[PDB]
Amino acid sequence: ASGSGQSTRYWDCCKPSCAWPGKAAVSQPVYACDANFQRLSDFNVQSGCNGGSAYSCADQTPWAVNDNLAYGFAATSIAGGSESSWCCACYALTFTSGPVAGKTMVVQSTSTGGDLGSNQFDIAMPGGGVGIFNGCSSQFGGLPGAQYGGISSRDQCDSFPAPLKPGCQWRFDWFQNADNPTFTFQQVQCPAEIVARSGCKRNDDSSFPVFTP
Ligand SMILES: OC[C@H]1O[C@@H](O[C@H]2[C@H](O)[C@@H](O)[C@H](O[C@H]3[C@H](O)[C@@H](O)[C@H](O[C@H]4[C@H](O)[C@@H](O)[C@H](O)O[C@@H]4CO)O[C@@H]3CO)O[C@@H]2CO)[C@H](O)[C@@H](O)[C@@H]1O
Numbered sequence: 001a002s003g004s005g006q007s008t009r010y011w012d013c014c015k016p017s018c019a020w021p022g023k024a025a026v027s028q029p030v031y032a033c034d035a036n037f038q039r040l041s042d043f044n045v046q047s048g049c050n051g052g053s054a055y056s057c058a059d060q061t062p063w064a065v066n067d068n069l070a071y072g073f074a075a076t077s078i079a080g081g082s083e084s085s086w087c088c089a090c091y092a093l094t095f096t097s098g099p100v101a102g103k104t105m106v107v108q109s110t111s112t113g114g115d116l117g118s119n120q121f122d123i124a125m126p127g128g129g130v131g132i133f134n135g136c137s138s139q140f141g142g143l144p145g146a147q148y149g150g151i152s153s154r155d156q157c158d159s160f161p162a163p164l165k166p167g168c169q170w171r172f173d174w175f176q177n178a179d180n181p182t183f184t185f186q187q188v189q190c191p192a193e194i195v196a197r198s199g200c201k202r203n204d205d206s207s208f209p210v211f212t213p
């Protein structure tokens with residue numbers, strides 16, 4: 001996959017869609033975590049957004065590799081695609097608007113929910129906004145922020161559970177509080193560091209270009 005896309009920001013604490021078995025041909029699904037941010041060994045645990053006990057892991061958060069490059073995670077709806085084709089795939093995003101224009105972020109798709117056909121990437125960052133499901137309410141009694149768009153200032157990250165705080169701060173620290181920047185994207189082999197966090201590598205990962213910074 002490649003093309004143009006539209007971004008948003010989110011963190012709903014839910015079990016990500018690609019954390020289920022059978023969604024794609026992968027080494028293993030994305031890890032889910034308990035409410036205390038500990039990895040679950042069972043990949044079939046019901047989502048904490050659906051009455052269950054499996055939540056998004058805190059290490060599936062974005063970080064700066066250097067001033068021009070970040071790694072992270074996204075929910076994706078890729079035109080022409082399906083969970084079979086995107087789950088656990090990585091994409092090099094080159095931002096084309098906002099304060100981050102010209103910077104690169106490599107994201108692994110771990111979930112979905114955007115409009116079909118849209119090439120929408122919902123970029124994961126704690127404090128980006130819980131949206132329609134506040135799973136964060138059931139996990140730990142909720143995060144600060146507007147339901148959509150989340151927190152407004154970096155000092156609000158001081159209220160976050162510790163494992164989520166670095167990813168909260170990244171939004172203000174590398175991402176320059178960019179508001180829904182546009183991008184172009186290219187599907188790439190996943191950086192080892194990203195697979196280390198999610199646990200999930202596609203069987204077809206090597207068929208894509210190596211990412212070059
Ligand atoms: O089939 C296995 C199992 O499935 C259970 O249902 C799952 C779905 O399989 C799964 O796709 C769904 O995933 C959610 C995810 O948890 C949410 O975080 C995500 O939310 C997205 C939102 O859609 C978008 O606006 C943006 O994309 O990011 C956000 C956060 O605001 O949406 C996806 C897709 O809906 O979760 C379900 C569980 O709740 C069944 O319940 C189970 O019986 C089956 O065995």
Ligand SMILES: OC[C@H]1O[C@@H](O[C@H]2[C@H](O)[C@@H](O)[C@H](O[C@H]3[C@H](O)[C@@H](O)[C@@H](O)O[C@@H]3CO)O[C@@H]2CO)[C@H](O)[C@@H](O)[C@@H]1O
Pocket residue numbers: 007008009010011012122128129130131132147148149150179180
């Ligand atoms: O559904 C995807 C995602 O949405 C996230 O919220 C979005 C809102 O949908 C979006 O309307 C808002 O955009 C506003 C922008 O931030 C403002 O600055 C203003 O100028 O215009 C826009 C009004 O349309 O952006 C937010 C953040 O990306 C949720 O946070 C998330 O949970 C959900 O998954």
